[PDB]
Amino acid sequence: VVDWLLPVGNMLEGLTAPVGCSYMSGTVTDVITGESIISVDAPYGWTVE
Amino acid sequence: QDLMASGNTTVKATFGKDSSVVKWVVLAEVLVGAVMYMMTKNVKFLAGFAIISVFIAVGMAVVGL
Numbered sequence: 382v383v384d385w386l387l388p389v390g391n392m393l394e395g396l397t398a399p400v401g402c403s404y405m406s407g408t409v410t411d412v413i414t415g416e417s418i419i420s421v422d423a424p425y426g427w428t429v430e
Numbered sequence: 431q432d433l434m435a436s437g438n439t440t441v442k443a444t445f446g447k448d449s450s451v452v453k454w455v456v457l458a459e460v461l462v463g464a465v466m467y468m469m470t471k472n473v474k475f476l477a478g479f480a481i482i483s484v485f486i487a488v489g490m491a492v493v494g495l
């Protein structure tokens with residue numbers, strides 16, 4: 382049983398190590414909200430208031 | 431808004447009653463009216479000793495800023 386867990390035991394240790402990734406095309410949203418009061422102034426002166 | 435043609439009070443203090451224009455217009459009559467007694471020598475140019483203060487008042491007090 383111990384000698385049979387050689388390919389199975391290696392898979393449990395590989396799924397825990399950090400694996401690198403490759404990007405594709407990301408999206409950067411630009412939303413602005415606000416008001417302008419001229420508190421208206423007153424003137425002157427006136428016153429009231 | 432305001433205007434850009436004025437806002438300095440420069441022409442008002444130069445061409446007005448309390449300026450120097452009233453002095454240059456009062457000596458021009460005696461310069462030529464008091465010396466024309468050579469050829470003419472007649473009482474004619476005597477109607478201008480009262481219209482000086484009248485013409486300056488009917489033109490300056492029209493707008494008045």
Ligand SMILES: CCOP(=O)(O)OC[C@H](O)CO
Nearest residue numbers: 470471472473474475476477
């Ligand atoms: C009498 C006051 O002067 P004027 O009115 O200029 O006179 C007109 C004729 O020239 C008289 O000669």
